[PDB]
């Protein structure tokens, strides 16, 4: 029964935590303390991940370096204690955060890329010639093919230029030292509009510009290229366009093609005007709009525009190359190219003329699991099933050998793969063969496409490179994820996994079919580091592949500042429940090995600081986890409901679509106010900056997922890929269905968009299936869709609520559940109208566990309406079956320093003259008495309203616990504990660490033993309000 699950949830409904061990500083005492604390809070289990080692933190004197017998003994003891407590465990597939590295991996077994060298020679007889050696990572390299290409032009690929620059920004509020300048190493920097001029002694013919950076720089890709023959009259060549790119974009330079231009002068104009705000697929645009260029290389030889991404070396999307940039004369036909692989030093003969000797091979990409300690080394080849198996055998499998095997088999039941951060790869020893099987033709004659050298035509070159990227994405799934899935099943473990996008070339949804537990990620107060697109990848992936439990790495905080408590985490959690997550994992519980240092070890101040030495752990983490468990009990029930599927298209790479990107496709669904807010945000006038958190300056108009609650105004959608369309979709009763309960009425085929700008042509099999779905009744709306909703087609909104109300809907055999959550810090009363006809709603309170089965409701036009009142950040589930306190003198006892005071009136601890109270962080126990005049009458209900609580409070009346109050409304039901006459009142109030850390920083610690490696602090330098501020009142109801 649903009631029993809500009231007595199963262990599958409990939240979990990530558990990090820092710098090999680990103790058994701390292990016991941590795991008991986890059990006390109501956590179901933990993912044990050690982070860095003794070298990275020698000051901590760590005794548990990864893979030492001492470390293995800590792991064994952890399994022993989890077993004793009834907790389960997971581990990651490598040391550190990610991804699949270890000291057992050689360069040959690591991720591979196509590399090359080249040299121009006279044709005729060639004997004993030593060719240049391509890039060889740690000296590993293997030849594949040697081509000879007849030169298009005998002139040199680059020439000497004199480089100069000029500020063009004319005004009076310009810092002259930030205007364009070139340093002694030639690095170009600017904060203001400028140009950079290249002058050649003789006219130079340029066909592309290779942009070389030190780290990422969005602005560098926005140069406007101009040229002159005479030194004053300049003509437009091209406005350069930034390719879509993720944060891991430094492995390759960026080649921007232009129409072939012959000139003595080239000017590269720059202005920050027109800049797009930052996002996950224009990651560099998150940062200050300054220009910084290491080098511009102006090349003569023809290359495909943005070929480095198109070759699969790095995760990028750019438009196909225009014919005006690469025409037929710029391409090689296969007949022109002489294959010298056999004879190759080189000895053979060639027709007269000049030949480019293109020596192609492969080497390691150069990536490690760099956040590891003892387990650090090269990332495994993601296309080599033997290397993937080897990774599994040497870390995860050893947890069942080197510990206690029978205990390990009982408690270590989860195998985790985290979010990818090992770059991309476009080769392996089996890649040619896999390409041949999957794409239906041989890649090998076309291998120079992987260096961006065009063949046959631009269109043909880019059709083949798309096929290369497609193959890459398929091998991630069919090798890496398939092998690990087999391994997990072999070891009786559930497989959880985070995203592959936006660092490894992929269809970002595709791998979720191979795992048990798709896992998203959401950050707290960290706009520059949040991954809303990762969340939608994991949720869409789970929905379309029928994975019912959707995990989420939650609350990661780029700079924790010690003022965080559950009360300010609720709204954030709720909007991610609305997206579709149903098992939270706290990021992060750090192991604090010292029992006499608080709050102790952290991930160098990266939050959330969710651990035993939190001021609010014992009561606050427990109360929050109780709320979480009740929510998850219902949010794991049945199947999620979503009316709309949105096709993710045929470009590579690809992934789920953020709501903002569908606004031009569905302007009527989003509404006019959203259309207008997006116009302004994307215009991004003045490129404004914001600082959030302290010390992190970024693009103020960056999309913020807090502002995208219920963006379709009463419908939900999943992103939906080619795989799911062709392999899984069926039409039943006019809806598109998928195994595991997905059922969509609408299939949106979006307009061309930043991640699919061409757009990539629909394959015959996709057009056929679309038409089949169309004839069977699935709605394929014509775009842009301008009506408010789909009611004209018989598809009404699921839930009609006002703005800033987050929701989701699930359904199964026992009925329908709507989660409804207030995202504002205010009390609201509003109508909620649900697409449910003729059933009786109930209001189930997840904070308290109370069920109100007799709520008023109206039945209008075959919907059901209720009037809800929600306190700040309050949420509720709607389920459809199938007077002044007059206190005596307070005694207040500050538990952490034993100080006791007597006060008549309530007070803010932070305004006290006594420094040990002023800077106090921890718990204080308030004791008083109050008179209650009457016997409590039948059906009468009495609440003690607490007024303002800084930050949480546990109420006891005559010794009876009346609740831990942590979120609005700030009241406890004291009905059952009240007696006529004198009543005893005890309230335990707990704040956050911020005030005591400030005090300790200034030589005014309110007690002994305060220490943390977390050094970030609020910029404001204020003490936070602290304590039971009140006023206290009774609310007597019926
Ligand atoms: Ca992670
Ligand atoms: Ca499309
Ligand atoms: Ca897009």
PDB file of C-alpha atoms in Angstrom, residues 21 224 258 305 565 783 977:
ATOM      1  CA  UNK A  21      39.094   9.818   2.283  1.00  0.00           C
ATOM      2  CA  UNK A 224      36.540  39.385 -37.365  1.00  0.00           C
ATOM      3  CA  UNK A 258      38.096  31.306 -44.454  1.00  0.00           C
ATOM      4  CA  UNK A 305      36.637  24.276 -40.775  1.00  0.00           C
ATOM      5  CA  UNK A 565      22.124  23.990   6.808  1.00  0.00           C
ATOM      6  CA  UNK A 783       7.445  24.515 -35.709  1.00  0.00           C
ATOM      7  CA  UNK A 977       2.317  16.632  25.460  1.00  0.00           C
TER       8      UNK A 977
END
